[PDB]
Design a binder for this molecule. Structure first.
Ligand code: HEM
Length: 146
């Protein structure tokens, strides 16, 4: 019931996927600059110009919309997830650790801007842990590391 809880807390996010999408990626890039290089479209953008950047916010919106779809599946996510693992391993070539980095940023932003309290934070970290474990498994099956 870490999923039942999370969906309760998701409302404020789904109310504005574009602003929160922009916040989450800004924070990722400011706190973990090495991750900006993994986005050819965004690499080399001045740190001063990230916040409020429309192309970043638009991609952030896509990120969150897809995470929303994953959360709403409440653990029966294989059919949504596998395609995400497919693209991220073979087209974008993203090492698993980066998924841990954005999960921790999402928790921090939701805590600060969307009312995610200590309890919600725990439930979300548990859900994210499940998803990343599943992503790891799919990466394995694709032969894209360990
Ligand atoms: C839970 C986390 C994430 C979700 C839900 C997600 C979702 C998506 C979606 C829906 C797309 C577009 C469709 C596709 O190509 O699969 C995509 C593209 C992409 N993702 Fe992710 N992503 C996640 C994490 C990351 C991370 C951590 C990075 C690198 C640090 C990353 C790098 C990329 C890149 C480079 C693209 C292509 C952008 C483009 O060409 O416009 N993703 N992501």
């Amino acid at each position: 019931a870490d999923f039942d809880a999370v969906l309760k807390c998701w409302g404020p996010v789904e109310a504005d996927y574009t602003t929160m999408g922009g916040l989450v990626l800004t924070r990722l890039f400011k706190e973990h600059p090495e991750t900006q290089k993994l986005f050819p479209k965004f690499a080399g953008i001045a740190q001063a110009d990230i916040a409020g950047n429309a192309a970043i916010s638009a991609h952030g919106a896509t990120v969150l919309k897809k995470l929303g779809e994953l959360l709403k599946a409440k653990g029966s996510h294989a059919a949504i997830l596998k395609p995400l693992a497919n693209s991220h391993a073979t087209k974008h070539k993203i090492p698993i650790n980066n998924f841990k980095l954005i999960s921790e940023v999402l928790v921090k932003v939701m805590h600060e801007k969307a009312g995610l309290d200590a309890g919600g934070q725990t439930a979300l970290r548990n859900v994210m842990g499940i998803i990343i474990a599943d992503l790891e498994a799919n990466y394995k099956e694709l032969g894209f590391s360990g």
